């Protein structure tokens, strides 16, 4: 695990973190590889690594969603490592966060999850919280299960389940 200081994202895709090319080379990471991230409070996340030409060697660019998921702020430190084992998921189960789906919400798959996931090959982990903007509503979801467990890539054959009671915040 290489340690890196958390910096702001330029690429706003939730699945993406960015490193300098020299840091990618040092870690033997290739553009598009899955990486495992460790943050505070024993939190983990899986992301896709890309290079960024303005990124300092000792830093990682990550968006607010990934920061929140790792319980880190700008300027905090995370660890990174390659996560090459991650397979295509058979199925995943995600549930919305109650306070983002109070009152009437359209079908979560159609409005949020399908556009979010479609052709993105997003790595996800059990326990992640992610945010989808469905114009102009933002719904947050929690990953309650993956198969395989506890992480997978959400691919064309992956079956996405989102039925159940909304999750309570905190």
């Amino acid at each position: 695990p290489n340690r890196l200081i958390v910096d702001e994202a330029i690429n706003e895709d939730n699945s993406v973190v960015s490193l300098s090319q020299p840091k990618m080379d040092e870690l033997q990471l290739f553009r598009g590889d899955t990486v495992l991230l460790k943050g505070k409070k024993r939190r983990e996340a899986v992301c896709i690594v890309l290079s960024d030409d303005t990124c300092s060697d000792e830093k990682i660019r990550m968006n607010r969603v990934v920061r929140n998921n790792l319980r880190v702020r700008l300027g905090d430190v995370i660890s990174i490592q390659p996560c090459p084992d991650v397979k295509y998921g058979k199925r995943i189960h995600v549930l919305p966060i109650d306070d983002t789906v109070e009152g009437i919400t359209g079908n979560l798959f159609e409005v949020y999850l399908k556009p979010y996931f479609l052709e993105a090959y997003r790595p996800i982990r059990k326990g992640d919280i992610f945010l989808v903007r469905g114009g102009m509503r933002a719904v947050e979801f929690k990953v309650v299960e993956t198969d395989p467990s506890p992480y997978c890539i959400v691919a064309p054959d992956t079956v996405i389940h989102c039925e159940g009671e909304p999750i309570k915040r905190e």
Binding site: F109, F117, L118, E145, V154, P156, V159, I160
Partner: peptide, 12 residues
């Protein structure tokens, strides 16, 4: 244990 319910195949 866990209730998966029913789901949608993402597709491409």
């Amino acid at each position: 244990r866990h209730n998966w319910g029913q789901g949608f195949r993402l597709g491409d």
